[PDB]
Design an enzyme around this catalytic site. Structure first.
Site, PDB file in Angstrom:
ATOM      1  N   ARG A   1       0.819  -1.216   0.000  1.00 53.27           N
ATOM      2  CA  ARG A   1       0.000   0.000   0.000  1.00 53.27           C
ATOM      3  C   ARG A   1       0.849   1.261   0.000  1.00 53.27           C
ATOM      4  NH1 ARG A   1      -4.504   3.256   3.526  1.00 53.27           N
ATOM      5  NH2 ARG A   1      -6.076   3.217   1.818  1.00 53.27           N
TER       6      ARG A   1
ATOM      7  N   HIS B   1       0.372   4.260  -2.591  1.00 59.89           N
ATOM      8  CA  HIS B   1       0.006   5.601  -2.194  1.00 59.89           C
ATOM      9  C   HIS B   1       1.093   6.628  -2.528  1.00 59.89           C
ATOM     10  CE1 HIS B   1      -3.740   5.360   0.546  1.00 59.89           C
ATOM     11  NE2 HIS B   1      -3.907   4.690  -0.582  1.00 59.89           N
TER      12      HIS B   1
ATOM     13  N   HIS C   1      -6.231  -5.900  -3.032  1.00 59.94           N
ATOM     14  CA  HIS C   1      -7.071  -5.944  -1.850  1.00 59.94           C
ATOM     15  C   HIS C   1      -7.307  -7.374  -1.353  1.00 59.94           C
ATOM     16  CE1 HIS C   1      -8.902  -1.639  -1.846  1.00 59.94           C
ATOM     17  NE2 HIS C   1      -7.624  -1.671  -1.473  1.00 59.94           N
TER      18      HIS C   1
ATOM     19  N   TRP D   1     -10.322  -8.879   3.509  1.00 61.48           N
ATOM     20  CA  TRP D   1     -11.090  -9.197   2.321  1.00 61.48           C
ATOM     21  C   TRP D   1     -11.140 -10.691   2.051  1.00 61.48           C
ATOM     22  CZ3 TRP D   1      -7.751  -4.974   2.527  1.00 61.48           C
ATOM     23  CH2 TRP D   1      -8.271  -3.714   2.175  1.00 61.48           C
TER      24      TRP D   1
HETATM   25  C1  HEM Z   1     -10.657   2.828  -5.562  1.00 58.77           C
HETATM   26  C2  HEM Z   1      -9.340   2.533  -5.112  1.00 58.77           C
HETATM   27  C3  HEM Z   1      -9.001   2.138  -3.769  1.00 58.77           C
HETATM   28  C4  HEM Z   1      -9.577   2.487  -2.602  1.00 58.77           C
HETATM   29  C5  HEM Z   1     -10.740   3.419  -2.323  1.00 58.77           C
HETATM   30  C6  HEM Z   1      -8.855   1.843  -1.558  1.00 58.77           C
HETATM   31  C7  HEM Z   1      -9.129   1.925  -0.206  1.00 58.77           C
HETATM   32  C8  HEM Z   1      -8.503   1.212   0.816  1.00 58.77           C
HETATM   33  C9  HEM Z   1      -8.849   1.310   2.213  1.00 58.77           C
HETATM   34  C10 HEM Z   1      -9.950   2.179   2.817  1.00 58.77           C
HETATM   35  C11 HEM Z   1      -7.951   0.487   2.846  1.00 58.77           C
HETATM   36  C12 HEM Z   1      -7.886   0.161   4.303  1.00 58.77           C
HETATM   37  C13 HEM Z   1      -6.839   1.034   4.993  1.00 58.77           C
HETATM   38  C14 HEM Z   1      -6.805   0.629   6.462  1.00 58.77           C
HETATM   39  O1  HEM Z   1      -7.844   0.804   7.178  1.00 58.77           O
HETATM   40  O2  HEM Z   1      -5.740   0.149   6.881  1.00 58.77           O
HETATM   41  C15 HEM Z   1      -7.091  -0.135   1.890  1.00 58.77           C
HETATM   42  C16 HEM Z   1      -6.113  -1.049   2.185  1.00 58.77           C
HETATM   43  C17 HEM Z   1      -5.224  -1.540   1.217  1.00 58.77           C
HETATM   44  N1  HEM Z   1      -5.179  -1.186  -0.102  1.00 58.77           N
HETATM   45 FE1  HEM Z   1      -6.426   0.014  -1.076  1.00 58.77          FE
HETATM   46  N2  HEM Z   1      -7.797   1.116  -2.092  1.00 58.77           N
HETATM   47  C18 HEM Z   1      -7.849   1.295  -3.456  1.00 58.77           C
HETATM   48  C19 HEM Z   1      -6.919   0.844  -4.360  1.00 58.77           C
HETATM   49  C20 HEM Z   1      -5.786   0.071  -4.061  1.00 58.77           C
HETATM   50  C21 HEM Z   1      -4.741  -0.262  -5.003  1.00 58.77           C
HETATM   51  C22 HEM Z   1      -4.775   0.265  -6.420  1.00 58.77           C
HETATM   52  C23 HEM Z   1      -3.797  -0.961  -4.323  1.00 58.77           C
HETATM   53  C24 HEM Z   1      -2.496  -1.423  -4.740  1.00 58.77           C
HETATM   54  C25 HEM Z   1      -2.288  -1.997  -5.982  1.00 58.77           C
HETATM   55  C26 HEM Z   1      -4.261  -1.072  -2.960  1.00 58.77           C
HETATM   56  C27 HEM Z   1      -3.634  -1.802  -1.969  1.00 58.77           C
HETATM   57  C28 HEM Z   1      -4.087  -1.885  -0.632  1.00 58.77           C
HETATM   58  C29 HEM Z   1      -3.517  -2.754   0.385  1.00 58.77           C
HETATM   59  C30 HEM Z   1      -2.380  -3.710   0.089  1.00 58.77           C
HETATM   60  C31 HEM Z   1      -4.229  -2.545   1.525  1.00 58.77           C
HETATM   61  C32 HEM Z   1      -4.062  -3.216   2.861  1.00 58.77           C
HETATM   62  C33 HEM Z   1      -3.162  -2.377   3.765  1.00 58.77           C
HETATM   63  C34 HEM Z   1      -2.900  -2.998   5.122  1.00 58.77           C
HETATM   64  O3  HEM Z   1      -3.309  -4.140   5.417  1.00 58.77           O
HETATM   65  O4  HEM Z   1      -2.224  -2.310   5.950  1.00 58.77           O
HETATM   66  N3  HEM Z   1      -5.480  -0.398  -2.786  1.00 58.77           N
HETATM   67  N4  HEM Z   1      -7.438   0.349   0.632  1.00 58.77           N
END
Ligand code: HEM
Length: 291
Positions: free
Chosen positions: A45, A49, A172, A188
């Site tokens: 992430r 970001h 995700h 997820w």
């Molecule tokens: C419409 C696009 C996206 C939205 C709105 C979104 C939103 C989110 C949200 C709300 C979280 C949870 C953050 C937390 O509470 O720790 C999350 C986690 C994450 N997202 Fe996204 N995301 C998007 C796209 C992506 C993309 C494009 C990637 C990478 C290719 C990505 C990779 C991740 C990963 C790996 C996590 C888990 C982080 C953790 O476990 O600490 N996301 N995302």
């Protein structure tokens, strides 16, 4: 503004494989983090970001400048929790002070995907740190409470098409939402520190209910204990996204290949690679090296 990749002086593939390896070894060692999920997901992430602030219209933001190291960006509410990935990388940067910040943040993501048994992600060096005033403002990362139209329009700014968006969203599978961090809670799926196409399978196959979480936000929940954000769920509400979701649910290799391309692209938006730049590097995993 043009951002030309500039290879860290005298460095070559072996130098960066050493950085890869140090990241990968710490990923293995520091396994307790996040209830034993480990740092893989948050490093993915972080890479996203730090790259996803890019604006194709004027080449602001993006991975090149490593601007997350400045307080405006590390304190973006959208980046809540990513400080854990940054702290992880700090001893890596201390050991290898020659690597640029952008190169290290992006390499962290590559390394995490690969060590989690994901596809190989070719990676190019040459990001150069840029000054504090080049840090993009908050607000360029996406909201999660929105629909497919939002998602599609959002990602046009990153020059991503429908296939690229659906592929990227497959990340995700990894990690989880944390209520205090995003206002969403839950993983997820079951395999959340192994890179697979589970995100797509769960979207199609779980029985989802639209519930409110304890932060009063709506999310989709299953009896298995999994969740989807509204933006995740939008991928099966929109018929164009739905087709692609079904494709990836039914072809792991295709998902791997398309993810790899899209993720490299994401990590490289905004960067101009000279004609005589090194070819992209494909790092060996620790497993492949016998380490
Ligand atoms: C419409 C696009 C996206 C939205 C709105 C979104 C939103 C989110 C949200 C709300 C979280 C949870 C953050 C937390 O509470 O720790 C999350 C986690 C994450 N997202 Fe996204 N995301 C998007 C796209 C992506 C993309 C494009 C990637 C990478 C290719 C990505 C990779 C991740 C990963 C790996 C996590 C888990 C982080 C953790 O476990 O600490 N996301 N995302």
């Amino acid at each position: 503004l043009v951002h030309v990749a500039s290879v860290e002086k005298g460095r070559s593939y072996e130098d960066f494989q050493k950085v890869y390896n140090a990241i990968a070894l710490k990923l293995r060692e520091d396994d307790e983090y996040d209830n034993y999920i480990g740092y893989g997901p948050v490093l993915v992430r972080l890479a996203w970001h730090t790259s996803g602030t890019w604006d194709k219209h004027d080449n602001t933001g993006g991975s090149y400048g490593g601007t997350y190291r400045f307080k405006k960006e590390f304190n973006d509410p959208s980046n809540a929790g990513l400080q854990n990935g940054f702290k992880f990388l700090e001893p890596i940067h201390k050991e290898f002070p020659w690597i640029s910040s952008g190169d290290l943040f992006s390499l962290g993501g590559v390394t995490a995907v690969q060590e989690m048994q994901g596809p190989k992600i070719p990676w190019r060096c040459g990001r150069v740190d840029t000054p504090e005033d080049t840090t993009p403002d908050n607000g360029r990362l996406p909201d999660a409470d929105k629909d497919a139209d939002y998602v599609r329009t959002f990602f046009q700014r990153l020059n991503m098409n429908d296939r690229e968006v659906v592929a990227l969203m497959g990340a995700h599978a990894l990690g989880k939402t944390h209520l205090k961090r995003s206002g969403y809670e839950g993983p997820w799926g079951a395999a959340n520190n192994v890179f697979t196409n589970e995100f797509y399978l769960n979207l199609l196959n779980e029985d989802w209910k639209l519930e409110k979480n304890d932060a009063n936000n709506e999310q989709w929940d299953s009896k298995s204990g999994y969740m989807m954000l509204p933006t995740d769920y939008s991928l099966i509400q929109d018929p164009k996204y739905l087709s692609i979701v079904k494709e990836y649910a039914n072809d792991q290799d295709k998902f791997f290949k398309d993810f790899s391309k899209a993720f490299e692209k994401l990590l490289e938006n905004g960067i101009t690679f000279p004609k005589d730049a090194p070819s992209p590097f494909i790092f060996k995993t620790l497993e492949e090296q016998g380490l």
